[PDB]
């Protein structure tokens, strides 16, 4: 005869959702709140076990989305609000040593430290965040919402944050170098905390991400579905050099008692348009690898074309990102312009101060100007492409830079992670009868 026996502490897990806490080693993301990360992150490699992963149905991405939005919202509350700034702005063009006609010189009235006294000041504003009301202009956000001036003492540097599951839960890391994104993983490992996930905010190009292990990897929920964005991960990084050689000057205007508005005083020196440089040789070989990998899924003897974005808002039609505090919006039409069968590329870029992060409305933000020449170097470690269909596919495929939401961007880092709830209780038969 057989008898049931209760086993406590069995290595059994079940898929579930939980709130993982942050961990990290004067920045928008709360550093003091995050618990100090373990200097020796344990990683136990599990043998003879295969787990089924799912990057699209992973709740970690959604939780990260909520946490990043919450941190961004709370990071703006302890500083200056630009609600009285909406006023009639008398503006003209800036033609002092210029090659681009965008920038504008606006003068307007503003409050001072005293409620009964005003002041007439001036500030240089770009044409993107200024709209004509009728030589009379106003801010684009006045008819939408009062922007909250970003705190100047906090930095926008995306420091890496480690997501750690709480007690009773574990994180499974798929170490299969050829991970396809979903499906069974023949090599998993338990980790208390994930690797450094830099919350880089960008569209059409995954900057400062994690590179592939062996070759370029293409992932998508449905390759045959045109409405699903195609995530691409490079095995080698494509260095990008972005800069703003304007050398802006910041001026503090006392908008109210104890609160100041940082404005762009004057642009000393020759005014030049911002731009990003990418080596055409590295980009050429990278695109060659990408098309070679694409042909694996779409078959051989098919011409694959790379065209620019179809259209839409400036946030989706251009590679938006943050560099040294300033928010860039670069036109990537020069990169995705080619067709495959069988020196440096300069990308014109534009800068905007009034921004609407997370594709939301009613909670805009004003990025204050940064003094000096801005210059930064990033690693293009991935892409977000969108394929368009055709009649019988017409032996061709067109891919355009997809301006998908931030979940797709953050999914490229959490593709090899999943949270599982431990179930230490278990019952199994055994030949033994409890003594009465």
């Amino acid at each position, epitope marked *: 005869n057989l008898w049931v026996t209760v086993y406590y502490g069995v290595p059994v897990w079940k898929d579930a959702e939980t709130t993982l806490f942050c961990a990290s080693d004067h920045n928008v993301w709360a550093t003091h709140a995050c618990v100090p990360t373990d200097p020796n992150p344990q990683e136990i490699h599990l043998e003879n076990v295969t787990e089924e992963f799912n990057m699209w149905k992973n709740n970690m991405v959604e939780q990260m989305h909520t946490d990043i939005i919450s941190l961004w919202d709370q990071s703006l509350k302890p500083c200056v609000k630009l609600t009285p700034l909406c006023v009639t702005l008398q503006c003209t063009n800036v033609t002092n040593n210029i090659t681009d006609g965008e920038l504008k010189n606006c003068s307007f009235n503003m409050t*001072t430290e005293l409620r*009964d006294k*005003k*002041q*007439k000041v001036y500030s240089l504003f770009y044409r993107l965040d200024v709209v004509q009301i009728n030589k009379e202009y106003r801010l684009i956000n006045c008819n939408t919402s009062a922007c909250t001036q970003a705190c100047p003492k906090v930095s926008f540097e995306p420091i890496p944050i480690h997501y750690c599951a709480p007690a009773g839960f574990a994180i499974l890391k798929c170490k299969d170098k050829k991970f396809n994104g979903t499906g069974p993983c023949p090599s998993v490992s338990t980790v208390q905390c994930t690797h450094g996930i830099k919350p880089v905010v960008s569209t059409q190009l995954l900057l400062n991400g994690s590179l592939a292990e062996e070759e370029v990897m293409i992932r998508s929920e449905n390759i045959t579905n045109n409405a699903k964005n195609i995530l691409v991960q490079f095995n080698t990084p494509v260095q990008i050099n972005c800069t703003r050689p304007n050398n802006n000057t910041r001026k503090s205007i006392r908008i109210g008692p104890g609160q100041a508005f940082y404005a762009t005083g004057d642009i000393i020196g020759d005014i030049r348009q911002a731009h990003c440089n990418v080596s055409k040789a590295t980009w050429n070989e990278t695109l060659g690898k990408v098309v070679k990998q694409l042909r694996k899924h779409f078959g051989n003897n098919t011409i694959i074309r790379f065209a620019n974005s179809s259209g839409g808002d400036l946030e989706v039609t251009t590679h938006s990102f943050n560099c040294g505090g300033e928010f860039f919006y670069c036109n990537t039409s020069g990169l995705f312009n080619s067709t495959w069968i069988s020196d440096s590329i300069t990308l014109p870029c534009r800068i905007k101060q009034i921004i609407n992060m997370w594709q939301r409305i009613g909670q805009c933000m004003y990025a204050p100007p940064i003094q000096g020449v801005i210059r930064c170097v990033s690693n293009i470690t991935g892409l977000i492409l969108t394929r368009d269909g055709g009649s019988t596919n017409s032996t061709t495929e067109t891919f355009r830079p997809g301006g998908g939401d931030m979940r797709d961007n953050w999914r490229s880092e959490l593709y090899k992670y999943k949270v599982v709830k431990i179930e230490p209780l278990g019952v199994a038969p055994t030949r033994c009868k409890r003594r009465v």
Partner: antibody
Amino acid sequence: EVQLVESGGGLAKPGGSLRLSCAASGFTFSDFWMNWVRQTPGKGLEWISGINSGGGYTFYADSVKGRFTISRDNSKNTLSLQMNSLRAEDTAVYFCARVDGDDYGYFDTVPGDSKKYYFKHWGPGVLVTVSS
Amino acid sequence: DIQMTQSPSSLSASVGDKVTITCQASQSINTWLAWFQRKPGKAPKSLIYKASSLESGVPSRFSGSGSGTDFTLTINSLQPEDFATYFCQQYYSAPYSFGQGTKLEIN
């Protein structure tokens, strides 16, 4: 550099009307106040009118209150001085004068009203005579 | 009104000779006074501002002094292009006032 040029002067009948115009150049006309000063032959200067950069706060001298009317057109970058009910002693060389500085900075109700100004730039002056 | 009085109404001097022009105010105007120079037929030019600061670009020979109600302009050496009408304007409190006008003529 900065240059102001006048016109509109000439002979006028007593008790009639006339208009003066002064064109500004070399500076941002929408950021500096304007004033009018006349010099009758044989005596010193006598200030007669003024206006802010935005076209408001028209302040004249007690000897020309109501009769004169100063106005400006920022778009055309020109100043005008409408005259009504002219008299014989109004015969003088009229000079349009720009204040020393801009109207930027702290202000109570009209930009530049809390700042002392002096007529840095002046026009050549046009002689206007009123006789029968 | 703060009337202004300028003296002498006319002065004759030779080339290189020092010239002094003085003008008083009916009431104290601290130091808010500026001097001017009007050549025959041409528009006036600003010479001294703040009654003591020298205008940029004007030659260093011109100099202003005085405070309160009395102010004075000095010309160390009369150059051949210095003969013209000189004015003194008060701008401490509106309405503005100007001097009667003094013309310098070569001796």
